[PDB]
Amino acid sequence: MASMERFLSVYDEVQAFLLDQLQSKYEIDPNRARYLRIMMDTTCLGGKYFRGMTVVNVAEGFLAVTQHDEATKERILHDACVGGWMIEFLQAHYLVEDDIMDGSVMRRGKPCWYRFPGVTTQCAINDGIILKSWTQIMAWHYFADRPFLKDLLCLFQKVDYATAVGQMYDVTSMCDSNKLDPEVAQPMTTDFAEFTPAIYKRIVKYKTTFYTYLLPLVMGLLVSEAAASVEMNLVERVAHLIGEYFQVQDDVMDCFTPPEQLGKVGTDIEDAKCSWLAVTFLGKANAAQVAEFKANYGEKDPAKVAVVKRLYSKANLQADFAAYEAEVVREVESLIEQLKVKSPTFAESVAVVWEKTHKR
């Protein structure tokens, strides 16, 4: 069975399980079950399933170099699928809530869930909550007798929290830390002194890397009973590196990818995001360029957004990007080599993860 087709079949099984349980234990009626079914399909389905399929892929690598009964292979693959759907539903939680937080309009070329006419923010906040609760309902049902249950739950928990922390880093990234105060309306930074590589790196590490790269890799190890076969510090370090590279691409596209290809009109400039373009610009700009930037960044006015985009074009940030990229390729390959010491076949799963990130 091809990995993708196995993974999508399990979606159906998990969906049927969750909804049958709502009926039989939670007194749901058919119409509210239908609403939740559509919510699940709309918020969970339609991407590439890179995160979920990572769990499956790691697990397949382990199976190919380990002795198991056929029924144990199926069990392990089914577990990887379920584990993968937990990460996919965790993302869907965060995407629903983040879209509401940010006033987003579109996502993957369709309206954000909260904007559906029969949804509204009042319901969508709660729907987002449900999406995360379903992660835990999955885990407890399918992994009830599994030896990895505790470690999986504890890991999941920590990634979740890290992601929420990162969300806090992200939405506060345009304020001056020393002015943060629940009592006082927050001004945008005027100096941009916190648009640094170290600061940028923290936002991304927490907001994106833990749930996108670390979790899928380590969950693939946990369901395979393979974690003690790899050096975990290396898994952490390579995840953070690749996850950083992923976000830098996403930042570059926000500004330069046409909206019909992005699936989104990008607003990073208008939202004054601590983006890789702004940090990297500020790291090479002269005084005049910096002042022009401060006079136009973080304002909805299209003329002002056009000025910042001009500044970024003239600043030759493609060069700094290719230099960043070259250094990431070096470090990732170094970490892949280090991972060959104890786990050559895991190393190759990491290599496929890096290739799919590096190309797309």
**Residue 226 binds which entry of Zn ion, ligand LXJ, a copy of itself, none, CB below 5-8 Å type-dependent:** ligand LXJ
Under the binding rule (CB under 6 A), the answer on residue 352 touching ligand LXJ is no
- Report how far residue 274's alpha carbon sits from residue 197's, in angstroms, rounded to the nearest whole number: 10
Phi, psi of 26 (to 5 degrees): -120, 10
- Beta-strand runs (E) in the chain: 106-107, 110-111
Q: Which of 332, 346, 350, 354 binds ligand LXJ (CB under 6 A)?
A: 346
Question: Whose Cβ is closer to a copy of itself: residue 17's or residue 35's?
Answer: 35
Long-range contacts (CB closer than 8 Å, 24 or more residues apart) made by 193-202: 194/274, 195/274, 195/278, 195/279, 195/282, 196/279, 197/279, 197/283, 199/173, 199/274, 199/279, 200/274, 200/275, 200/276, 200/279, 201/244, 202/169
Residue 29 labeled ligand binder: no
Residue of 92, 139, 230, 241 that binds ligand LXJ (CB under 6 A): 230
- The window from 71-79, 90-98, 155-163, 213-221 that contacts Zn ion (CB under 5 A) reads 90-98
Rounded to 5 degrees, φ, ψ at 272 are: 55, 40
Told to check if 226 binds ligand LXJ by CB under 6 A, we report yes
Residues 157-216 that bind a copy of itself (CB under 8 A): 157, 160-162, 164-165, 167-169, 171-172, 177-178, 180-186, 202, 205-206
Handedness of CA 166, 158, 77, 43 (dihedral sign): negative
Residue 166's nearest CA partner among 215, 211, 194, 203 is 203
The Cα–Cα gap between 193 and 163 comes to: 24
Does 84 help bind ligand LXJ (rule: CB under 6 A)?
Answer: no
**At closest approach, how far in Å is the CB of 134 from a copy of itself?**
8
Q: How far is the CB of 135 from ligand LXJ (least distance, A)?
A: 23
The C-alpha atoms of residue 238 and residue 328 are separated, in whole angstroms, by 10
Residues that bind Zn ion (CB under 5 A): 98, 102, 250, 254
Would you list which residues are annotated within the binding site for Mn(2+)? Answer: 98, 102, 170, 250, 254
Residues that bind a copy of itself (CB under 8 A): 22, 26-29, 31-32, 34-36, 38-39, 42, 97, 100-102, 116-119, 121-123, 125-127, 129-130, 133-134, 136-137, 140, 150, 153-154, 157, 160-162, 164-165, 167-169, 171-172, 177-178, 180-186, 202, 205-206
